[PDB]
């Protein structure tokens, strides 16, 4: 079996503005098998209200998913994404950065 490790991108739907309502996205792609654990973090704690896209794949057969939640960015709150896959020995945390 050929396992593929996921590529991860953490970003916002629209350019981030402090105090303005937005969407926090986590795009996971290039992975195999389909089973994946994706959490969006707010200062380290798991956000409960998190939705995701319907499972699809690229021409190379690797899967891609979009995880998203409503968020209001501030200058001090730390946002991130925690991703766990069978290819990962430890969960991978990618910190959200406006620009990046």
């Amino acid at each position: 079996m050929i396992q593929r490790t996921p590529k991860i991108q953490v970003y916002s739907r629209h350019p981030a503005e402090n105090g303005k309502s937005n969407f926090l996205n986590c795009y996971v792609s290039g992975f195999h098998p389909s089973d994946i654990e994706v959490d969006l973090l707010k200062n380290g704690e798991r956000i409960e209200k998190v939705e995701h896209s319907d499972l699809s794949f690229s021409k190379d057969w690797s899967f891609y998913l979009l995880y998203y939640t409503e968020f209001t960015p501030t200058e001090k709150d730390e946002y991130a994404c925690r991703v766990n896959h069978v290819t990962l020995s430890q969960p991978k945390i990618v910190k959200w950065d406006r620009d990046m």
């Binding site: 739907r13 996205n25 795009y27 195999h32 098998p33 319907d54 021409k59």
Partner: protein, 274 residues
């Protein structure tokens, strides 16, 4: 311009509890319009685009019947491939299927597709001629011989050059406002010094549709591929896409660098300079 329709199916065996998970997704270019989930309470083909909601109840009844037949065959095929590769019952395995067609700007048939994979690796694929099959390994050759015996390639061609093309033509006309649209990218550049002698230049492309785009950095007009970070095109979540390209430049030489943005939504390609 040219248009495409693609269906992506995923079937994952669960040795623990419950029958295999079956997920089906339908796309018209980069826009999702249908979905089917075996874990969802609905147990029917569900709309994902506003223009497909105008389809009659018979269409949804037919699509649900097809998805139940697809799920059941994928469930039997997981067991069949388990035996072909001589694998244990306690392991989780995946079958992936992609099929669809391409139409030109005039609506004429361009290409037909049908490709299958086992555990993320090519298994069997229908060739461009829609007359022959390509078997990836010895186990797939068993399927190839069986499918040639029942002339499966001809039945695939009938669907791809028939119902598939007719379906795509109808969807394009019904959703002309969203599907035949081109959203140009909103572009901007950021400059951030990493030291007193170097600065990162990042060129952005946001809110564009379709997903196809080209972001290229150039120094004195020469293509800079060497030392440029190009991220994968990502969905914004509102039906549009995002992409950025960054390059580290020596301080005081920012004006020598240009970012070239190519998209079908642009009347002319953009040239951005700090």
């Amino acid at each position: 311009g040219s248009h495409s329709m693609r269906y992506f199916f995923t079937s994952v065996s669960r040795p623990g509890r419950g029958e295999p998970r079956f997920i089906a997704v339908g796309y018209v270019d980069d826009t999702q319009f249908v979905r089917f989930d075996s874990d969802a309470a609905s147990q029917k083909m569900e709309p994902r685009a506003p223009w497909i909601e105008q389809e009659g109840p018979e269409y949804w009844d037919q699509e649900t019947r097809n998805m139940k037949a697809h799920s059941q065959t994928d469930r039997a095929n997981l067991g069949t491939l388990r035996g072909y590769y001589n694998q244990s019952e306690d392991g989780s395995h995946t079958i992936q299927i992609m099929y669809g067609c391409d139409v030109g700007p005039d609506g004429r048939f361009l290409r037909g597709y049908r490709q299958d994979a086992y555990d993320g690796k090519d298994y069997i694929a229908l060739n461009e001629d829609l007359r022959s099959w390509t078997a990836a390994d010895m186990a797939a050759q068993i399927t190839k011989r069986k499918w040639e015996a029942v002339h499966a390639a001809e039945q695939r061609r009938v669907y791809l050059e028939g119902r598939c093309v007719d379906g795509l033509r109808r969807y394009l006309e019904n959703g002309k406002e969203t599907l035949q649209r081109t959203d140009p990218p909103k572009t901007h550049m950021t400059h951030h010094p990493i030291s007193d002698h170097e600065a990162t230049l990042r060129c952005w492309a946001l809110g564009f549709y379709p997903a196809e785009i080209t972001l290229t950095w150039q120094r004195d007009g020469e293509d800079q591929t060497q030392d440029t970070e190009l991220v994968e095109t990502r969905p914004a979540g509102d039906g549009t896409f995002q992409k950025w390209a960054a390059v580290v430049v020596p301080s005081g030489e920012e004006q020598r660098y240009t970012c070239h943005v190519q998209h079908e939504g642009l009347p002319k390609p953009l040239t951005l300079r700090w």
